[model samples]
Target: KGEELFTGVVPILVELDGDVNGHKFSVRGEGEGDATNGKLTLKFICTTGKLPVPWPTLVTTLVLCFARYPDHMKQHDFFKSAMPEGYVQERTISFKDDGYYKTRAEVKFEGDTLVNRIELKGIDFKEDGNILGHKLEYNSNSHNAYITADKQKNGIKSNFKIRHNVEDGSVQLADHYQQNTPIGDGPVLLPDNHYLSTQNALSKDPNEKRDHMVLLEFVTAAGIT
Candidate 1:
């Protein structure tokens, strides 16, 4: 059996220091490693509400993160959430790349109301040769959720003008954004912080909003924000 130890809370000193037969031992795990022609095990992580997305659909995302990308940059992030508390929340992944970000939510009230098709347009943006400023806007059918980040170089100020639209409702599910920080108050908890460490094992488009999504979240919801 392989030895397993936790290093953050508890520590251990491990020494293999040598070879297995004539060749050095080889190993692989869920995150990253050098693979060998020994025992084969495929470990992938995902979550679901009812039935998870099949692996065939998920493996391509895995391949892009593991095999295709040469460089990846996640400048900032956040998204609309249907949390377990019946609250709808949103956070603008600030442009400063500062790592201090927060989620804004609609205060929950007890009324059997569903949310509208929050028209999400304007991630529409412009780019210059030197690229002086950056911002994005989302236009909607009725309710417009607009966000913008403007600065000389590193813009940290992005104002969010948000309001609820109507109500038809969405599937009670949530997915990872940038990192899994165990976001809103947990009734439906999202498992996070496991995927970002292995740099080669991630996917992102610097200008486009693409992410390595894992761990589906089953949710309840408070209101639409």
Candidate 2:
């Protein structure tokens, strides 16, 4: 399929270069994905001039820089959670409810990794003590992303190969696994009746969904999409 662009949609990024609170800086947006349908991963790169600002203050400055783009910043739950304590300011942004669906947004430091992560909502599994979750392992220097999903009850563990496709400016999933078994180049198929197997369910509840089969995007200093 050809590259698709949605009309009447807001441009992913806007550039700003100026001073804030006596600090000179240049900020730009870079990342891929859109707001409504696909993932909207955006990161603001702020280059301060000359004098270095304290890390904590710098973080606050970054948040204010994104104030103009409220929707972009508000969509990701982690953005707020990751902010320094007492730095959070509640601002409301209207999100269009196209229908009954769920979206999961994760924002973390560039080189961070998560192991045996557990999610309370937006997942296919019930709140039973099955220990369902996934792992995200990445190497910044090598720019490689690896993800693993564990279905504890079924004794099925899945692994995935994640790569950034420079040609398309998007991420791609190249391989998949089931337990120690390799399962082709894509996601392993489950029974259509399975909760995670339905299209709507996966879209709405991505917490336990397999990563290899989903469209993934990155939020860099440039912008998400």
Which lDDT values do the candidates have, in the order given?
A: 0.20, 0.23
**Model 1 per-residue lDDT tens digits across residues 55-74:** 22221122111111111211
For candidate 2, write residues 62-129 as lDDT tens digits: 21111112243333222222221212121111112211102112222222111111111122222221
Per-prediction TM-score, please? Answer: 0.17, 0.20
lDDT of 1 at 29: 14
How large is the C-alpha RMSD of every model relative to the true structure? 22.5, 21.2
Query: Model 1: what TM-score?
Result: 0.17
lDDT of 2: 0.23
Total colliding residue pairs, candidate 2? 13
Shift in Å, residue 163, candidate 2: 35
Cα RMSD (Å) between model 2 and the true structure? 21.2
Q: Residue 187, candidate 2: how far off, in angstroms?
A: 45
Give the lowest summed-lDDT range of ten residues in model 1.
Answer: 1-10
| Cα RMSD, model 1 | 22.5
